[PDB]
Design a protein around this nucleic acid. Structure first.
Ligand SMILES: [Mg+2]
Ligand SMILES: [Mg+2]
Ligand SMILES: [Mg+2]
Ligand SMILES: [Mg+2]
Ligand SMILES: [Mg+2]
Ligand SMILES: [Mg+2]
Ligand SMILES: [Mg+2]
Ligand SMILES: [Mg+2]
Ligand SMILES: [Mg+2]
Ligand SMILES: [Mg+2]
Ligand SMILES: [Mg+2]
Ligand SMILES: [Mg+2]
Ligand SMILES: [Mg+2]
Ligand SMILES: [Mg+2]
Ligand SMILES: [Mg+2]
Ligand SMILES: [Mg+2]
Ligand SMILES: [Mg+2]
Ligand SMILES: [Mg+2]
Ligand SMILES: [Mg+2]
Ligand SMILES: [Mg+2]
Ligand SMILES: [Mg+2]
Ligand SMILES: [Mg+2]
Ligand SMILES: [Mg+2]
Ligand SMILES: [Mg+2]
Ligand SMILES: [Mg+2]
Ligand SMILES: [Mg+2]
Ligand SMILES: [Mg+2]
Ligand SMILES: [Mg+2]
Ligand SMILES: [Mg+2]
Ligand SMILES: [Mg+2]
Ligand SMILES: [Mg+2]
Ligand SMILES: [Mg+2]
Ligand SMILES: [Mg+2]
Ligand SMILES: [Mg+2]
Ligand SMILES: [Mg+2]
Ligand SMILES: [Mg+2]
Ligand SMILES: [Mg+2]
Ligand SMILES: [Mg+2]
Ligand SMILES: [Mg+2]
Ligand SMILES: [Mg+2]
Ligand SMILES: [Mg+2]
Ligand SMILES: [Mg+2]
Ligand SMILES: [Mg+2]
Ligand SMILES: [Mg+2]
Ligand SMILES: [Mg+2]
Ligand SMILES: [Mg+2]
Ligand SMILES: [Mg+2]
Ligand SMILES: [Mg+2]
Ligand SMILES: [Mg+2]
Ligand SMILES: [Mg+2]
Ligand SMILES: [Mg+2]
Ligand SMILES: [Mg+2]
Ligand SMILES: [Mg+2]
Ligand SMILES: [Mg+2]
Ligand SMILES: [Mg+2]
Ligand SMILES: [Mg+2]
Ligand SMILES: [Mg+2]
Ligand SMILES: [Mg+2]
Ligand SMILES: [Mg+2]
Ligand SMILES: [Mg+2]
Ligand SMILES: [Mg+2]
Ligand SMILES: [Mg+2]
Ligand SMILES: [Mg+2]
Ligand SMILES: [Mg+2]
Ligand SMILES: [Mg+2]
Ligand SMILES: [Mg+2]
Ligand SMILES: [Mg+2]
Ligand SMILES: [Mg+2]
Ligand SMILES: [Mg+2]
Ligand SMILES: [Mg+2]
Ligand SMILES: [Mg+2]
Ligand SMILES: [Mg+2]
Ligand SMILES: [Mg+2]
Ligand SMILES: [Mg+2]
Ligand SMILES: [Mg+2]
Ligand SMILES: [Mg+2]
Ligand SMILES: [Mg+2]
Ligand SMILES: [Mg+2]
Ligand SMILES: [Mg+2]
Ligand SMILES: [Mg+2]
Ligand SMILES: [Mg+2]
Ligand SMILES: [Mg+2]
Ligand SMILES: [Mg+2]
Ligand SMILES: [Mg+2]
Ligand SMILES: [Mg+2]
Ligand SMILES: [Mg+2]
Ligand SMILES: [Mg+2]
Ligand SMILES: [Mg+2]
Ligand SMILES: [Mg+2]
Ligand SMILES: [Mg+2]
Ligand SMILES: [Mg+2]
Ligand SMILES: [Mg+2]
Ligand SMILES: [Mg+2]
Ligand SMILES: [Mg+2]
Ligand SMILES: [Mg+2]
Ligand SMILES: [Mg+2]
Ligand SMILES: [Mg+2]
Ligand SMILES: [Mg+2]
Ligand SMILES: [Mg+2]
Ligand SMILES: [Mg+2]
Ligand SMILES: [Mg+2]
Ligand SMILES: [Mg+2]
Ligand SMILES: [Mg+2]
Ligand SMILES: [Mg+2]
Ligand SMILES: [Mg+2]
Ligand SMILES: [Mg+2]
Ligand SMILES: [Mg+2]
Ligand SMILES: [Mg+2]
Ligand SMILES: [Mg+2]
Ligand SMILES: [Mg+2]
Ligand SMILES: [Mg+2]
Ligand SMILES: [Mg+2]
Ligand SMILES: [Mg+2]
Ligand SMILES: [Mg+2]
Ligand SMILES: [Mg+2]
Ligand SMILES: [Mg+2]
Ligand SMILES: [Mg+2]
Ligand SMILES: [Mg+2]
Ligand SMILES: [Mg+2]
Ligand SMILES: [Mg+2]
Ligand SMILES: [Mg+2]
Ligand SMILES: [Mg+2]
Ligand SMILES: [Mg+2]
Ligand SMILES: [Mg+2]
Ligand SMILES: [Mg+2]
Ligand SMILES: [Mg+2]
Ligand SMILES: [Mg+2]
Ligand SMILES: [Mg+2]
Ligand SMILES: [Mg+2]
Ligand SMILES: [Mg+2]
Ligand SMILES: [Mg+2]
Ligand SMILES: [Mg+2]
Ligand SMILES: [Mg+2]
Ligand SMILES: [Mg+2]
Ligand SMILES: [Mg+2]
Ligand SMILES: [Mg+2]
Ligand SMILES: [Mg+2]
Ligand SMILES: [Mg+2]
Ligand SMILES: [Mg+2]
Ligand SMILES: [Mg+2]
Ligand SMILES: [Mg+2]
Ligand SMILES: [Mg+2]
Ligand SMILES: [Mg+2]
Ligand SMILES: [Mg+2]
Ligand SMILES: [Mg+2]
Ligand SMILES: [Mg+2]
Ligand SMILES: [Mg+2]
Ligand SMILES: [Mg+2]
Ligand SMILES: [Mg+2]
Ligand SMILES: [Mg+2]
Ligand SMILES: [Mg+2]
Ligand SMILES: [Mg+2]
Ligand SMILES: [Mg+2]
Ligand SMILES: [Mg+2]
Ligand SMILES: [Mg+2]
Ligand SMILES: [Mg+2]
Ligand SMILES: [Mg+2]
Ligand SMILES: [Mg+2]
Ligand SMILES: [Mg+2]
Ligand SMILES: [Mg+2]
Ligand SMILES: [Mg+2]
Ligand SMILES: [Mg+2]
Ligand SMILES: [Mg+2]
Ligand SMILES: [Mg+2]
Ligand SMILES: [Mg+2]
Ligand SMILES: [Mg+2]
Lengths: 124, 138
RNA sequence: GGCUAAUCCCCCAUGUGGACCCGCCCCUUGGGGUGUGUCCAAAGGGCUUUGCCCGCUUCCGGAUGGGCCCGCGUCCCAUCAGCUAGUUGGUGGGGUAAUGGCCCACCAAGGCGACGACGGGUAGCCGGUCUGAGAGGAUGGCCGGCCACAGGGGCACUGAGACACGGGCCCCACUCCUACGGGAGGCAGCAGUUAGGAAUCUUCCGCAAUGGGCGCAAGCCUGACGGAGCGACGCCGCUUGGAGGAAGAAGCCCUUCGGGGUGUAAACUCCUGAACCCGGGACGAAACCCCCGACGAGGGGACUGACGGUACCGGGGUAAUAGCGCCGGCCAACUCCGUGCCAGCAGCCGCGGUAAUACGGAGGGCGCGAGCGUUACCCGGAUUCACUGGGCGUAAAGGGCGUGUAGGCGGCCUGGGGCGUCCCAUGUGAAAGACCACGGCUCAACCGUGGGGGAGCGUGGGAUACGCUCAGGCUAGACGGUGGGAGAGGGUGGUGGAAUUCCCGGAGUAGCGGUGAAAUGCGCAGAUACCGGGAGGAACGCCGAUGGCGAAGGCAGCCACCUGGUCCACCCGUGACGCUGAGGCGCGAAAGCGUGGGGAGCAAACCGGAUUAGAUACCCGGGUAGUCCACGCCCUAAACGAUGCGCGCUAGGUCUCUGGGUCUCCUGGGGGCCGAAGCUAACGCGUUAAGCGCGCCGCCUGGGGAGUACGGCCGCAAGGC
RNA sequence: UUCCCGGGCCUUGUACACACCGCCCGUCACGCCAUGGGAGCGGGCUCUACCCGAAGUCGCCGGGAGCCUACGGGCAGGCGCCGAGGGUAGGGCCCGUGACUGGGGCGAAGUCGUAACAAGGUAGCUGUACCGGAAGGUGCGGCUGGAUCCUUUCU
């Protein structure tokens, strides 16, 4: 474009969309499960993936993944939502956070425990 | 019509050199002649003269090259390896004195046209003035 | 209703001076002087009361604080294109400290807008901050500056100052009081409660310091403030020991059963001595006051801590917290077991469907370390909005073509000006931050002191190359003159032949037609094939090209008139009159729409015949709109060179059309093909650029959703932009 | 040497590359997210015309119609303009809700066709137009971004 054209028109700054309406921008929101369920993954894999539909304090309702192995959660559990998607499942944009609220940590889990919300094992 | 005569000089020169001519006629004006004076002084051209062509006056810019070469491509190095306009009609450019540019870490130039006359980079610094930044050459 | 004091209120007086009307002078927007006329002051209190301190009045200047006004800068949407009645100016007037439609009456009919008015969306702004190599992007928490608001809306009073957060009136919502009449509230002040949320502290100490209000002072007030408490929220310092100690215990790990690993790690040896115990124990603090001198200066001169018995100095003294992520690649770190498309992992690529360095533990390893990971958000990377710094022949991207408005851009020579541009001087660019240096807490973080820098804007001075500009030349661009050319360029009328169809006539039988084969259809009302005559419509064989003309779409018989563009020669005329072109306006294949004609052949739809597994298709036979014309709409396209216009530069060779030449050839101007240099991802391009440059317009920014939705505008509709 | 099969060499087109026992398009069915439209409803706001109008400032009255008076005037009170807001009648504005529905886009993967890629078996694409609810057929015109000089599906 000429310069007179850049003066006339000028470059367009570029917007972006938030891959997450947790809305509120907040780093997490609290919400209450509706469905706790399983689903069938996308094409390249096969498995049973545990997930909860949730009502969120944001006036917002979403399927959210339940990471770890052992999960307790049921239809009235109240849980804290994380953000991050499960690439092979449909419509799950967020993660549940273990150890917080009703979702408890992964029991028997010795290795990556910041994630998975599991306290430290004792020793003698 | 011709449109930026000074670009058109520098260009006539760029082409001329790449096809290795001995000389070229750029149609003439005191400003081009001044641009050239500086080129000669600085060692880029051999020199230039004023000629007439079917009556209408030009400038022969005689051209400088490297010596001949080794292997495939005997074509000699260029003396003006690079020539380009900077200020143009439609975007004019002016440097203050403290903005005048270091061209190829000094081995090239910048023709500034100042209120003191047309000078090189260093020439303007040592002179202490700013101007319309015409081209860089190297 | 009644009493009464004052530095409360009022009236005379004095007039230093001041206000105001009219005159004069100077100055120049309402600045200053002056004359006359008019109007204007005051408060007392305390002492050692004979003199001073505290105040009071009118004025002049100062200082500091502000009001108002102007240039410039200050986000997204044009799917917001028009907005405007005090609205735009004026005269008089009200108001104010003061200009002002700020307000009011009367008069004019203006003001604003693509240089984005109006509308809608978001938003306190800046100093600065984060990010970035920079340009730039993002942001504006704390500290400093300005603004604005104090439950929502309106309003004024008081005052130097407010339209007043802890002042007042009214309306509205809500909480509380209520003898139902009516009243009371206003933490976005320090704490604290409550809700909401992912989440954000103590209803602490102190007036010692600093600052502020009142006070002659003593002194009161101060949730400003100085401190303490809470939370790894951030930064910075610090500890979890130091040295010696196996050719290397045990356990645990692999193992090729030889061994390798954990690992100098531990045990143990020895030394220091975080915590903690003991004593001392701050600066911050010298004023206000005291006295002498005169309540000055000067001089001495004593009282005054929240933090705190804290920081710190001395003494004594104990081996005395480690965690978190990660180890398939990007990426530093690999092995065994377990699970077997499960359980799970997952930022992207992609792991797991029996040997998994990717899942889960374990050994070991890497990275950090009182942290370490996660999510969210910002910049970076991203030269992926490209000013620095990108593109559009086939990748996304040249607008279908043109005319031409605003706008952008502008050959050569000289002169004036000096607006851009440049230089110097100076003002400004607060402080804090940032950069430099030194210093203060044992260091740093943190702080102080000094230095330096700085775009921008004010003023003064200066330069004149380029850019503006004004005046004057020029002729190389552009236009013109004359003479000559080629052409399916356009419009209008005419007219020629071939062919088809049809009708008439003659002659002549038994089929014709059509296909891979067939059938439908036609044919004894005599078709086909043949000869002659007529009617009508549409299209123009050969020439014809690898050709020409046009801006594009597009344009073919011949003739004449009307008419556009264009090339060459001559070098004659004007004298930069130029290029581009958002908006506009006009053209714009075919199909399609309206009205009216026309209708030979062809032919969407349709009817039939075949064919196939079915046929709705290809193939056959019929056939309607339509194709043609006039006029009026529609405005699309592979509207193709998938290549915007103009100009300048950069080997040649070859074929051609068409001018001019001294016509083996040269020289303009078109059309092609090869190929310099160069470009290009490649293919290709290559004086008919996709090369090298400059100007201006159009356009692009992953695929699908989709040229969809919605809004607008056009259109008769179809549908278009 | 035409044909059937298997093969060698050059060349050409290609969207195939587990390579034509390849690719792939659409329809109906079925499982998901999200959109428009959407009648009315619930409500927030703003504009205009009219109407009612608290406070308060200003303006006028301020009268043998009140209070003060030094008769100069002052206050009370009255009326008025302006006016926060309220009601009445229509234009948009945004949010919420929604009977009704439009396709959509992947997604288990079934359904019948074979439209495109090889001259995809009728060369393809294309603006349009009529048809078939299937890819689609056909008409007119255009493009080359087309190969080489009866039919016959799928894996
Ligand atoms: Mg699978
Ligand atoms: Mg010379
Ligand atoms: Mg530049
Ligand atoms: Mg009384
Ligand atoms: Mg009383
Ligand atoms: Mg008084
Ligand atoms: Mg008096
Ligand atoms: Mg006097
Ligand atoms: Mg005067
Ligand atoms: Mg007097
Ligand atoms: Mg008195
Ligand atoms: Mg004063
Ligand atoms: Mg001022
Ligand atoms: Mg402004
Ligand atoms: Mg009005
Ligand atoms: Mg008025
Ligand atoms: Mg006035
Ligand atoms: Mg303007
Ligand atoms: Mg706001
Ligand atoms: Mg902001
Ligand atoms: Mg930096
Ligand atoms: Mg960068
Ligand atoms: Mg950038
Ligand atoms: Mg900024
Ligand atoms: Mg900002
Ligand atoms: Mg602020
Ligand atoms: Mg602040
Ligand atoms: Mg200010
Ligand atoms: Mg308010
Ligand atoms: Mg409140
Ligand atoms: Mg209010
Ligand atoms: Mg006062
Ligand atoms: Mg006032
Ligand atoms: Mg206020
Ligand atoms: Mg309060
Ligand atoms: Mg009250
Ligand atoms: Mg709560
Ligand atoms: Mg605090
Ligand atoms: Mg104090
Ligand atoms: Mg005293
Ligand atoms: Mg008090
Ligand atoms: Mg404090
Ligand atoms: Mg924490
Ligand atoms: Mg630290
Ligand atoms: Mg040791
Ligand atoms: Mg061992
Ligand atoms: Mg010891
Ligand atoms: Mg002291
Ligand atoms: Mg002290
Ligand atoms: Mg003292
Ligand atoms: Mg004394
Ligand atoms: Mg003293
Ligand atoms: Mg003293
Ligand atoms: Mg004191
Ligand atoms: Mg103490
Ligand atoms: Mg000690
Ligand atoms: Mg000791
Ligand atoms: Mg130890
Ligand atoms: Mg690695
Ligand atoms: Mg993992
Ligand atoms: Mg196994
Ligand atoms: Mg294994
Ligand atoms: Mg395997
Ligand atoms: Mg592993
Ligand atoms: Mg991994
Ligand atoms: Mg692992
Ligand atoms: Mg480990
Ligand atoms: Mg952290
Ligand atoms: Mg980024
Ligand atoms: Mg650029
Ligand atoms: Mg720049
Ligand atoms: Mg690009
Ligand atoms: Mg393509
Ligand atoms: Mg393209
Ligand atoms: Mg084009
Ligand atoms: Mg196009
Ligand atoms: Mg033009
Ligand atoms: Mg113009
Ligand atoms: Mg010029
Ligand atoms: Mg100047
Ligand atoms: Mg300065
Ligand atoms: Mg500073
Ligand atoms: Mg500081
Ligand atoms: Mg500092
Ligand atoms: Mg130091
Ligand atoms: Mg100046
Ligand atoms: Mg001069
Ligand atoms: Mg000049
Ligand atoms: Mg001069
Ligand atoms: Mg100009
Ligand atoms: Mg002239
Ligand atoms: Mg002449
Ligand atoms: Mg002529
Ligand atoms: Mg013609
Ligand atoms: Mg005939
Ligand atoms: Mg007959
Ligand atoms: Mg007969
Ligand atoms: Mg028959
Ligand atoms: Mg019959
Ligand atoms: Mg018969
Ligand atoms: Mg019959
Ligand atoms: Mg005949
Ligand atoms: Mg007829
Ligand atoms: Mg005839
Ligand atoms: Mg022909
Ligand atoms: Mg054509
Ligand atoms: Mg002609
Ligand atoms: Mg001639
Ligand atoms: Mg002449
Ligand atoms: Mg002349
Ligand atoms: Mg146009
Ligand atoms: Mg048309
Ligand atoms: Mg037509
Ligand atoms: Mg029709
Ligand atoms: Mg018609
Ligand atoms: Mg008709
Ligand atoms: Mg026919
Ligand atoms: Mg037919
Ligand atoms: Mg049929
Ligand atoms: Mg078949
Ligand atoms: Mg049939
Ligand atoms: Mg019809
Ligand atoms: Mg027509
Ligand atoms: Mg271009
Ligand atoms: Mg000739
Ligand atoms: Mg042509
Ligand atoms: Mg040529
Ligand atoms: Mg040629
Ligand atoms: Mg070529
Ligand atoms: Mg080459
Ligand atoms: Mg290039
Ligand atoms: Mg060119
Ligand atoms: Mg290119
Ligand atoms: Mg577009
Ligand atoms: Mg997309
Ligand atoms: Mg798109
Ligand atoms: Mg369309
Ligand atoms: Mg819309
Ligand atoms: Mg529409
Ligand atoms: Mg309509
Ligand atoms: Mg259409
Ligand atoms: Mg419509
Ligand atoms: Mg064979
Ligand atoms: Mg062989
Ligand atoms: Mg092909
Ligand atoms: Mg190939
Ligand atoms: Mg395959
Ligand atoms: Mg096949
Ligand atoms: Mg299917
Ligand atoms: Mg729905
Ligand atoms: Mg009223
Ligand atoms: Mg009233
Ligand atoms: Mg009035
Ligand atoms: Mg009276
Ligand atoms: Mg009254
Ligand atoms: Mg009213
Ligand atoms: Mg096919
Ligand atoms: Mg087809
Ligand atoms: Mg085909
Ligand atoms: Mg077929
Ligand atoms: Mg066919
Ligand atoms: Mg059909
Ligand atoms: Mg068609
Ligand atoms: Mg065709
Ligand atoms: Mg093609
Ligand atoms: Mg199939």
């Amino acid at each position: 474009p000429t310069i007179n054209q850049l003066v006339r028109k000028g470059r367009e700054k570029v917007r972006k969309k938030s891959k997450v309406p947790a809305l509120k921008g907040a780093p997490f929101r609290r919400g209450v499960c509706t469905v706790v369920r399983t689903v069938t993954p996308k094409k390249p894999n096969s498995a049973l993936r545990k997930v909860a539909k949730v009502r969120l304090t944001s006036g917002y309702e979403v399927t959210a993944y339940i990471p770890g192995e052992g999960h307790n959660l049921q239809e009235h559990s109240v849980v804290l939502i994380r953000g991050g998607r499960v690439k092979d499942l449909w419509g799950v944009r967020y993660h549940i956070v273990r150890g917080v609220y009703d979702a408890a940590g992964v029991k028997d889990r010795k290795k990556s425990r910041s994630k998975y919300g599991t306290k430290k094992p004792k020793e003698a | 019509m011709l449109t930026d005569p000074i670009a058109d000089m520098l260009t006539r020169i760029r082409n001329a050199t790449r096809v290795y001519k001995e000389s070229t006629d750029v149609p003439a004006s005191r400003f081009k002649e001044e641009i050239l004076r500086i080129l000669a002084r600085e060692g880029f051209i051999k020199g230039y003269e004023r000629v007439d062509v079917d009556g209408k006056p030009y400038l022969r810019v005689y051209l400088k090259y490297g010596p001949r070469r080794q292997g495939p491509d005997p074509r000699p190095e260029q003396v003006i390896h690079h020539i380009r306009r900077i200020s143009k009609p439609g975007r004019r450019v002016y440097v203050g004195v403290k903005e005048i540019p270091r061209v190829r870490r000094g081995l090239g130039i910048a023709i500034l046209s100042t209120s003191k006359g047309v000078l090189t980079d260093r020439e303007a610094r040592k002179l202490g003035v700013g101007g319309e930044l015409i081209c860089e050459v190297w």
